[PDB]
Design a protein around this ligand. Structure first.
Ligand SMILES: CC(C)(C)OC(=O)N[C@@H](Cc1ccccc1)[C@@H](O)CN[C@@H](Cc1ccccc1)C(=O)N[C@@H](CCC(N)=O)C(=O)N[C@@H](Cc1ccccc1)C(N)=O
Lengths: 99, 99
């Protein structure tokens, strides 16, 4: 739907059998979630933002249900304070900015 | 207008007589620009993101032209790698996410 930005744009996502809240972030190229138990294996990686850099595990081809829309893509798991849905998944569900 | 997320959502802003490029970020509550010469009074402040926290100066009541729309609000100036336009200004220009 159409979501304004008066409040943080938080949505419910279903990933790996679990329900979580995540922030839709147009300023993140990638999607990174707080530490959680995920299946399969990973390739380690480092990402940065405001503040500095962190280490995350990279899981590809993972299924996620965001506001119902099921999408498959890479998800990074690590020490991030909050779960963020990045552009790699946002394009998947046809998300656009408007004004 | 309507902007897809296949590429970073970069726009041109005019602030303090200067032209700069900034990333439209729905995941930032605040707007923070790389070090620049700004006139006026400020209160110091600290903000955080993924790799920890940084110190920035808080300049209030600042004018900015984003994609033509003039808006007035708080801007934070500091060691951010890129300039990001946060929700405090995005609501000013009527920006929404759609899908
Ligand atoms: C996630 C990934 C892929 C590593 O990308 C970024 O971190 N991108 C960030 C910087 C960047 C973008 C593009 C290229 C290079 C670098 C930017 O999108 C910021 N995204 C959010 C992600 C986020 C959100 C919530 C929590 C943790 C992380 C952010 O840090 N936003 C900050 C921006 C600074 C600001 N003050 O607005 C924010 O809103 N911080 C809040 C909330 C907060 C408090 C304390 C700690 C963390 C966050 C604040 N008031 O300080």
């Amino acid at each position: 739907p159409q979501i304004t930005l008066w409040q943080r744009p938080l949505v419910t996502i279903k990933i790996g059998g679990q329900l979580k809240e995540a922030l839709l972030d147009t300023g993140a190229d990638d999607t990174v979630l707080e530490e959680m138990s995920l299946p399969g294996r990973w390739k380690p990686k480092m990402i940065g933002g405001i503040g500095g850099f962190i280490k995350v595990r990279q899981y590809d081809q993972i299924l996620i249900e965001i506001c119902g829309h099921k999408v498959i893509g890479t998800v990074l798991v690590g020490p991030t304070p909050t779960n963020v849905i990045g552009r790699n998944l946002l394009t998947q569900i046809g998300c656009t900015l408007n004004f």
